[PDB]
């Protein structure tokens, strides 16, 4: 909160998307069985640890606003480029899928401290192309 007379910047650089890695996922709604299928494929270019080292990445996958237990991939130890190759299934009728949002969040597993989040992104069900399998890389967003 100031007139903003001094400051420099930098401000534009600070607004850019940080290099927090990317996640490849696939998505398909199975109309025969009435379930949403999500493929957590692989992540790339996860950030190196502050003073060198690699993280122990895993991915949490869940639907908002649903409050059911989130799914999680296995933990891949010491790698910034894990290949998960896992599929998760959400038994939800298509009619109920409308206002829901799929979230994929990559964490750094640690046995002795809270797991740091690496980054995340969201997929609103209302902008998903239900007629074809969806597959894409998404840059992980801060927070
Ligand atoms: Cu096609
Ligand atoms: Cu088509």
Swiss-Prot record:
Ca(2+) 3 binds at residues 110, 113-114, 116. The modification Phosphoserine is found at residue 142. Ca(2+) 2 binds at residues 49-50, 108, 110, 116. It is found in: Cytoplasmic vesicle, Secretory vesicle membrane; Cytoplasmic vesicle, Secretory vesicle, Synaptic vesicle membrane; Cytoplasmic vesicle, Secretory vesicle, Chromaffin granule membrane; Cytoplasm. Expressed in melanocytes. Ca(2+) 1 binds at residues 50, 56, 108-110. Residues 19-138 form the C2 domain. It comes from the Eukaryota. The modification Phosphotyrosine is found at residue 107. Glycosylated. Belongs to the synaptotagmin family. The first C2 domain mediates Ca(2+)-dependent phospholipid binding. The second C2 domain mediates interaction with SV2A and probably with STN2. It is linked to Baker-Gordon syndrome: An autosomal dominant neurodevelopmental disorder characterized by infantile hypotonia, congenital ophthalmic abnormalities, involuntary and hyperkinetic movements, stereotypic behavior, poor or absent speech, EEG abnormalities, and global developmental delay varying in severity from moderate to profound. Behavioral characteristics include sleep disturbance and episodic agitation. Calcium sensor that participates in triggering neurotransmitter release at the synapse. May have a regulatory role in the membrane interactions during trafficking of synaptic vesicles at the active zone of the synapse. It binds acidic phospholipids with a specificity that requires the presence of both an acidic head group and a diacyl backbone. A Ca(2+)-dependent interaction between synaptotagmin and putative receptors for activated protein kinase C has also been reported. It can bind to at least three additional proteins in a Ca(2+)-independent manner; these are neurexins, syntaxin and AP2. Homotetramer. Heterodimer; heterodimerizes with SYT2 in presence of calcium. Interacts with SCAMP5. Interacts with STON2. Forms a complex with SV2B, syntaxin 1 and SNAP25. Interacts with SV2A, SV2B and SV2C. Interacts with RIMS1. Interacts with PRRT2. Interacts with DNAJC5 in a phosphorylation-dependent manner. Interacts (via N-terminus) with RAB3A. Interacts with SYT12. Interacts with calmodulin. Interacts with DNM1 (via C-terminal proline-rich domain (PRD)); this interaction facilitates vesicle fission during clathrin-mediated endocytosis (CME). This is Synaptotagmin-1. It comes from Homo sapiens. The gene is SYT1.
């Amino acid at each position: 909160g100031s007139p903003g007379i001094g400051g420099g910047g930098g401000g534009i650089l600070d607004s850019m998307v940080e290099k927090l890695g990317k996640l490849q996922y696939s998505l398909d709604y199975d109309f025969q069985n009435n379930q949403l299928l999500v493929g957590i494929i692989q992540a790339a270019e996860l950030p190196a640890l502050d003073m060198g080292g690699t993280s122990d990445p895993y991915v949490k996958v869940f639907l908002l606003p649903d409050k059911k237990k989130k799914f999680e991939t296995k933990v891949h130890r010491k790698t910034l480029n894990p290949v998960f190759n896992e599929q998760f299934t959400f038994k939800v009728p298509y009619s109920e899928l409308g206002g829901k949002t799929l979230v994929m969040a990559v964490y750094d597993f640690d046995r002795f401290s809270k797991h740091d989040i690496i980054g995340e992104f969201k997929v609103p069900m209302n902008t998903v192309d239900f007629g074809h399998v969806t597959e894409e890389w998404r840059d992980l967003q801060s927070a």
